């Protein structure tokens, strides 16, 4: 007569509705667009189903 599984489901749902990802920001004194190429590459090769599945 399970009573803990609904809590686990609720917590997993709560953490699923709030995705978190990396975000590269230029360092202090660096060019304002220093992180555009790296961010584009990261979004290119981390948009696949495998990355989301692994994080989940």
């Amino acid at each position: 007569f399970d009573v803990v599984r609904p809590v686990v489901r609720k917590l997993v749902s709560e953490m699923r509705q709030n995705p978190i990802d990396v975000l590269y920001r230029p360092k202090d004194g660096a060019r304002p667009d220093a992180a555009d190429v790296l961010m584009g590459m990261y979004r290119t090769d981390m948009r696949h189903n495998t990355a989301k599945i692994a994080v989940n």
């Binding site: 920001r25 230029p26 304002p32």
Partner: protein
């Protein structure tokens, strides 16, 4: 603001706006003749009421 593509355009627009009112001190020569054109536009401004008063 950080740099994407559109926000880069918005930041450049804010750059030009701040330089053109003399609030910023131009460093790069692009800003230098930006301020030059702003001063030229300022010197070539006149209002109709002043002209009518001078005519009278």
């Amino acid at each position: 603001l950080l740099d994407g593509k559109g926000v880069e355009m918005m930041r450049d627009y804010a750059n030009k706006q701040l330089i053109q009112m003399g609030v910023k001190k131009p460093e790069t020569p692009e800003e230098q003749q930006w301020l030059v054109e702003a001063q030229q536009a300022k010197q070539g401004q006149q209002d109709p009421a002043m002209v009518q008063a001078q005519g009278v």
